[PDB]
Amino acid sequence: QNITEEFYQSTCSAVSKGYLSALRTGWYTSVITIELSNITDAKVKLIKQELDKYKNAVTELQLLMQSTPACNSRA
Amino acid sequence: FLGFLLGVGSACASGIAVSKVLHLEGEVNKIKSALLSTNKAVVSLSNGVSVLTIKVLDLKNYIDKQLLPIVIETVIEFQQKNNRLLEITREFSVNAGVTTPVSTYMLTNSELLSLINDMPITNDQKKLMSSNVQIVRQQSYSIMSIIKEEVLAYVVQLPLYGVIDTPCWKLHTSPLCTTNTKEGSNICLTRTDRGWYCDNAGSVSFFPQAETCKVQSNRVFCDTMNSLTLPSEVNLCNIDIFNPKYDCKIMTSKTDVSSSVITSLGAIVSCYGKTKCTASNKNRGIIKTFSNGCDYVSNKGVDTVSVGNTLYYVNKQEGKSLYVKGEPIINFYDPLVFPSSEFDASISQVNEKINQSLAFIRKS
Ligand SMILES: *[C@@H]1O[C@H](CO)[C@@H](O)[C@H](O)[C@H]1NC(C)=O
Secondary structure (H helix, E strand, C coil), X not given: CCCEEEEECCCCEEXXXXXXXXXXXXXXXXXXXXXXXXXXXXXXXXXXXXXXHHHHHHHHHHHHHHCCCCCCCCC | CHHHHXXXXXXXXXXXXXXXXXXXXXXXXXXXXXXXXXXXXEEECCCCCEEEEEEEEECHHHHHHXXXXXXXXXXXXXXXXXXXHHHHHHHHHHCCCCECCCCCCCCCHHHHHHHHHCCCXXXXXXXXXXXXXXXXXXXXXXXXXXXXXXXXXXXXXXXXXXXXXXXXXXXXECXXXXXXXXXXXXXXXXXXXXXXXXXXXXXXXXXXXXXXXXXXXXXXXXXXXXXXXXXHHHHHHHHCCCCCCCCCEXXXXXXXXXXXXXXXXXXEEXXXXXXXXXXXXXXXXXXXXXXXXXXXXXXXXXXXXXXXXXXXXXXXXXXXXXXXXXXXXXXXXXXXXCCCCCCXXXXXXXXXXXXXXXXXXXXX
8 A cells, every 4th residue: 555544533634644755955046058149131130130239139138137036035 | 634743944955055056167178178079978066966957858959059040941940949948947037036846848757767877876766766757757856947048957856766766655534433423512523643654764755645655556656755753652642542662643523524544445424414425336225325434435336425415436556454443432431521612523532521520629
C-alpha cells in the first residue's frame, strides 16, 4: 500500500500517510540574457512597423530597469 | 488555520541581490565576452555568485546581419524572433519587474530542462525537477535588472529542494460537537493543527495552510517559508491528544454546524442538527446515511458525499484506510464550566481554564 489513512473518531480527524517530501529550502539564481541590436513600398513599411515595435519595446525596458521591484512583504 | 503563527520574509530579496549587482561597472561587459563562443557558460560575479549566464535569442546577429543593408520572406522571419522580446516586455510592464510563474516566453521548456541539467546539483534532484517542471515553473521567479549596453538581462530564481524523499502526512480535522436534542447547549471542539507535515532534520516541518503545497502522486512540494518547524512530539496529538509531552492545538465554540472534509482516501463528516448527511455511489445511490456527530467513510465504493445542500466528490486514489474507533473527546468536557469561545487555544489552555473556574465553585 503506497498511500494509507487513519480516522480518529475521538478527535474528529484523519491522517493521510505515505507521502514523500520535495521541500523548497533555497534558491538557484541564473542571469538570462538577450543580445539586442542598438540602432512608400509595402514590403519596406511592414519592416518599419515591426522595427518600430522593437524600438518601443527597448525604450519601455529602459524605464523599468531603474525602478527596483519586490514580491510584497508581511504575510 | 494556524497560518497567523507563520513568520514573514522576502522571497524576492535572494534574486534581487543578483539584479542589484548586475548594475556594477564591467559586470555587463563580463558576460558579453563569455557568451560569444557558446550560448551557455558559467560566470563568476564581483559579489561572488556561481551564476549560469545563458544567451537566448541573438537579435544583434540578425538585425545587423540581415536587416542593416536595407535600412516578405524576411518580415515573417523577423516577426517570429521579435515576438519573444515583445511578450517579455509586455509581462515586465504589468508585473512591475517580478513575474511568477516563469513564462515560456521568459524561458522555454527546452531551455529550462537544459538549465536544470547544466546545474552543479545531485543526479537525483535533476530527475525530480525534470519530471515536475510545471511545479518548478510555478515555484520560480523572474526579476528585471538592466538593459545598459546592447544586452537585456533578467534574473531567473529557480527552487532548490534540500529536503527530498522524507515522510509526509496530511492532517485533516473537523468540528466535534455534542449531539443533544436542545436548540443550543451544545459544546464544540476542533483541532486547529490541520495541514501538511513533513519529517525534516530531527524536527517536523509543518505547513498550516496546506493549500500552499502542490502534490504530484506521493511527492509533496512545499515552501519552508510557509512552515513552522515543530518538535516530532507533535505527532502524539493524533494517537493521544491529552499527552503531557505536547500541548495539542484546539479551538472551542458552540457553533454546532454540519460540514464535510474530503480526505485523501475518503471523507470526514461533521453532521449536526436537522442536516441530511449522506454518502453515495454513482450507480447504487445512497449507501450510507450519516447520524448526528463526527463519522467518516472510506473512498472504496463511495463516489460522492452530500452534506445538507452541498455535494462533494470523493478522491478516487487507491489506498487502505483504517477507522480508529474511540469515545469523542467533547463528552469528557462538562458543558457548564467549558470555555466556549477559545478561537486559538490548546488542550492545556482549556484544562487550566476549567481547573480555575471550578475552584471558585468549590470554595463557595
Ligand atoms: C489542575 O489540573 C490538573 C490536571 O491537569 C490536576 O492534576 C490538578 O489537581 C488540578 N488542580 C487542582 C487544584 O485540583
